[PDB]
Structure formats: structure tokens, C-alpha cells
Amino acid sequence: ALSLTADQMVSALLDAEPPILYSESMMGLLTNLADRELVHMINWAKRVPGFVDLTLHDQVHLLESAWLEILMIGLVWRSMEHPGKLLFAPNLLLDRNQGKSVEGMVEIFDMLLATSSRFRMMNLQGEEFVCLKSIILLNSGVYTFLSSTLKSLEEKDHIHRVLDKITDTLIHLMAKAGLTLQQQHQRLAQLLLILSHIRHMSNKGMEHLYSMKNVVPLSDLLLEMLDAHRLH
Amino acid sequence: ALSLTADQMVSALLDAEPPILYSESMMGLLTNLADRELVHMINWAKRVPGFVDLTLHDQVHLLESAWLEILMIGLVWRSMEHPGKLLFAPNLLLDRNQGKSVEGMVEIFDMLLATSSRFRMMNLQGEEFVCLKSIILLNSGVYKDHIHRVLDKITDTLIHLMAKAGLTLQQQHQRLAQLLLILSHIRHMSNKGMEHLYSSKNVVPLSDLLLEMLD
Ligand SMILES: Cc1c(-c2ccc(O)cc2)n(Cc2ccc(OCCN3CCCCCC3)cc2)c2ccc(O)cc12
Ligand SMILES: Cc1c(-c2ccc(O)cc2)n(Cc2ccc(OCCN3CCCCCC3)cc2)c2ccc(O)cc12
């Protein structure tokens, strides 16, 4: 993981991409969709270099922290070519007014759409997207490990080393595309700052999802998926 | 005023730094302190290169969106040397057990402590800190062009500072990334803090208060 090159990081990340799922009232469809995506999210996470090096506990923690962000950046990505609409699924393309049908949703909708617009304006590349998504996975929960064990310190150091490698990969992509050094740093910063907005959206989204909340605790579901046996 | 050098930007940012305020029931004192810090925050913002070029509408918007983040990073910054504690003020140094005293605070408390621990492990520098804080101001409401131009300028300035500390180009973009990802955590803390504080908000807009402070 730490010995991979930039080209090999990109390659692994592209390979790891989950499928685009299809929708099979509107909130039910959306909720079913998210539920199905989660499973594929875990498989993806397990294929992000370094992730399986972590403890199962930490793996759960990172996903528990990042799952909505991860859903969102994927949505924003899929939607980038559909101005004013969100492509939840290839057969579930929703607009703003469709969002009003659900109490509390348009505000999130409008935020998602603006982020999609912002990606469009930057001409975000696929190679860039997967690096960002991976960053989200490894970063979002890293400051909330409520533990100061030696093992935990080791985990966090590993996480930041992998994060460093992904940064190296982003710059590499940008240099390859002919960007000057100054333009590289600037673009790196612009993209990373978008993650702050995605976090923000995620917290607003969690509130919203809670206003409409019975359920198994997410942790145990994540472990079940994550904690697989080795029997194949 | 994109025309400043990196050195000049850093200088302007360091000089713009607000004072450390004092306290004279915990929540009353905290609220009173934050309320007083806000005015100084407004005057700090006015001295951030590029900020006054914005419309007042936009100045107000940035401030309304960024104020708690700004209070937090300052708090974390002055709490670095107080392991296990948060220095809200020189005379208001509180531990997590003191935070547990207010329903819903200890979670945010622990997060602020983790952030201070991260800053400590990163050996965050003053010059870095003032750029970060400037980035928070200009980035927290943007979701435009002049704002991005100034943001780009602050990115250049951070890089400049890291180059001048002797870091390889690889180390530079690695550290730049590390610092900007911390801002995700700060936004997160702000979101959670805002949830906490409202658990209820005024009818009168904060925008009006901010507008009046700029006078
Ligand atoms: C961003 C986004 C949303 C969404 C989320 C929050 C909102 O307030 C509005 C829309 N939705 C709708 C939605 C998202 C998440 C939902 O979570 C319900 C909770 N549970 C099921 C989801 C998996 C893990 C947590 C348990 C329910 C509905 C998406 C569906 C698929 C997708 O790829 C992206 C999204
Ligand atoms: C980080 C931080 C907090 C805080 C708030 C909530 C938490 O759960 C944890 C810490 N507090 C406590 C606190 C922060 C903000 C508060 O805002 C409520 C009133 N606001 C009036 C309208 C907006 C401008 C600021 C005041 C009330 C209390 C701080 C005080 C000073 C300071 O420099 C930093 C902080």
C-alpha cells in the first residue's frame, strides 16, 4: 500500500469502483437504493489500499463516520452532467421540485446541486474523483477515534501515510495533465476545500434523515459486512 | 490587493490577529465571552486582504457561516499547551469533566481536544494558523471569483511558508493537504456545535448584528 506508485494507486482505485445501482414513494425508493449501495460501499472500502490493514473496529468507525459523505460525493459525481438534476440512479433522475415533495429535502437538494455545479465548473476528472472519495473514507473519522492506545496511534499513523500517498497521487495526476506547479497546489487546495462543504452537507443530511427516522445500530451492520470469514 | 507578496500577506495576517479576551454559570460565561469575541472577529476579518472588496452582503454571509469555526480554531490554537484542557480564556480553563456538566457538550469538547492534539502533533506554526483561519473565513460560505482568487493566494502563501522551512516539494503538498483536511473536521465540529447551541435560535437575523458591527 505504501509502496504503490501513483499510477498504481490510480489503477487500484479505478478498479475498486462500485457499480452504479438502479432504483427498483420517492423516499422509499431512495432509502432502498442507499441500503443496497452500502454493501457495495464496503467492498470498495476493502479495496482502498491500506484500509484492510486497519483493525475491524477502526474500519467500522471510519465507515460509520463517512458513509453519507461517500454517498453524496458519488451522487454529485453522477449528477455532474445533469444540470439542475440529481442522478440518484440512471432511472431515478430527480429535480428540485421533486425534492419539495419531501419535507426538509430541497435544502439538501440545493446543496448537492451546487456541489455538482462546482465539480462541473472545475471539470473534475474521474481519476481525481476516486482519490477524493478515498480521502473521505480515511479522513472523516480519523479525529474521532476515542482511544489513545499504542495500537490506535499506530493506526492513525498508517492512515495519514496512506492519505499522504493519495495526495501524491492527486498532484501526479495534475502534473501529468500539464498543470504548472502553482496550478497543481491551487487545484489540490480547491478540491480539498470542497470536502469541507461535503462534510457540511453530510451533517445537514444526517439531521434530515433523523427527522424522518425501527433500526439495527449501524455499527453492527457495518461489522457484519466487514467482518467476513475467509471461507470464500 | 492580490498584489501582496507572500511575506506581506503573512505580515498583514499576523498583525490583524485579535486579542485574547477574559471572562469576569458556565454556559452564561461562555456565551458572554463568545459574544465579545465576535466584535473583534469582525475587525480581524476587515483586515484580511481581499475581504473588504466584497459586497457587505457577501462579507456578512461569510461571517454568518464561519464565526463558530473561527472561534473553534482559535480555541484549539491557544489550547495546544494545555493537554486535556480548553483555554476558553486565561481565567476560564476547563477540562472535559467541566464540560460534562453541560448536557451535550462533552462530545464537542473531546473533538476540540483531538484537534488540539492534532495541531500539536503537526507542530502547527503561527503563520500557518493565520492562513488557515483566513481560509475558513473565505471558504465557509462560498457554496465567487475574487474569493477564489484570494483563496488561491493564501494557498500560494502556505506553500511559500513551507518552502521556507525547508520542506521538499513532496512534503509541501503533503502538509498543505494535511492542514486543509483538518478544516473538514473543524467544519464538522461547528455543525455539531451549532446543533448543540440550538438544542433555540432568534427570530432577528445575525446578519443584522454583523452589519452593524462593521460600522
Ligand atoms: C445523498 C443521498 C440521499 C439523501 C440523503 C439525505 C437527505 O437528507 C436527502 C437525500 N439519498 C437518499 C437516502 C440516503 C440515506 C438514507 O439512509 C437511511 C439510513 N440507512 C440506510 C442507508 C444506509 C446506511 C444507514 C442506514 C436514506 C435515504 C441517497 C440515496 C442514494 C445515493 O447514492 C445517495 C443519496
Ligand atoms: C468552541 C467554543 C464554544 C463551544 C460551543 C459549543 C460547544 O458544544 C462547545 C464549545 N464556546 C462556547 C459558546 C460558543 C458560542 C456561543 O454562541 C451563542 C451566542 N452567539 C451569539 C450569536 C453568534 C455569535 C456568538 C454568540 C455560546 C457559547 C466558546 C466560547 C468562546 C470561544 O472563544 C470558543 C468557544
Author numbering:
A (entry chain A): 307 to 330, 341 to 529, 532 to 550
B (entry chain B): 307 to 330, 341 to 459, 472 to 527, 530 to 545
Article, verbatim:
SERMs and SERDs elicit a structural rearrangement of the ERα LBD to sterically preclude binding of coactivators in the activating function-2 cleft.
RAL, BZA, and RU39411 showed the greatest efficacy of transcriptional inhibition in MCF7 cells with WT/Y537S ESR1. In addition, a new hydrogen bond is observed between S537 and E380, which was previously computationally predicted for the Y537S-BZA structure. BZA, RAL, and RU39411 show the greatest burial at 379.75, 377.87, and 325.21 Å respectively. These molecules engaged a new S537-E380 hydrogen bond that enforced a well-ordered antagonistic H12 conformation that corresponded to significant surface area burial within the AF-2 cleft.
